[PDB]
From a paper:
WzyE activity is regulated by a membrane protein polysaccharide co-polymerase, WzzE.
The 3.6 Å cryo-EM structure of full length WzzEPA that is found as an octamer with a large enclosed central periplasmic lumen connected to a membrane cavity defined by the transmembrane helices. The reconstructed 3D map shows only WzzEPA and that WzzEPA forms an octamer made up of four dimers arranged in C4 symmetry. A prominent conserved feature of the Wzz monomer is a long (approx. 100 Å) helix, which is approximately parallel to the long axis of the molecule. The transmembrane helices, which are not closely packed, enclose the disc-shaped cavity within the membrane resembling that seen for other Wzz structures.
Author numbering:
A (entry chain H): 202 to 241
B (entry chain A): 252 to 301
C (entry chain B): 266 to 301
Write the structure that this text describes.
Amino acid sequence: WAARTIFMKSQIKRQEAVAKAIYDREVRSVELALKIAQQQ
Amino acid sequence: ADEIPASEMFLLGRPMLQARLETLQTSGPHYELDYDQNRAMLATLNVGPT
Amino acid sequence: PMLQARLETLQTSGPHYELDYDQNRAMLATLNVGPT
């Protein structure tokens, strides 16, 4: 049980890291597209 | 409506394709879910084994 | 005009390749780098 809960904690941390990376990339692209669209 | 192959891509319009060019230029290469999973796996491998 | 721009874009764009071609090209590159 202890090994299992450690494993799920690691998996959850990994999923949060992946989601944070995707969100950061998307928000950066969105802001930069905002600046570009404002230019035109 | 969605995509007619590279044989026809002028059909959409000039502002259309111009904003297309600028969004491709300003957005990085498109990655899939496997890339992000592999990046997380590399991160947890680089943290080291306790 | 439709088919004329079609002809010019086919003429000016190379043959359409799939993902397997690019993966094989990368594989050939890393094989050509040599084994350490």
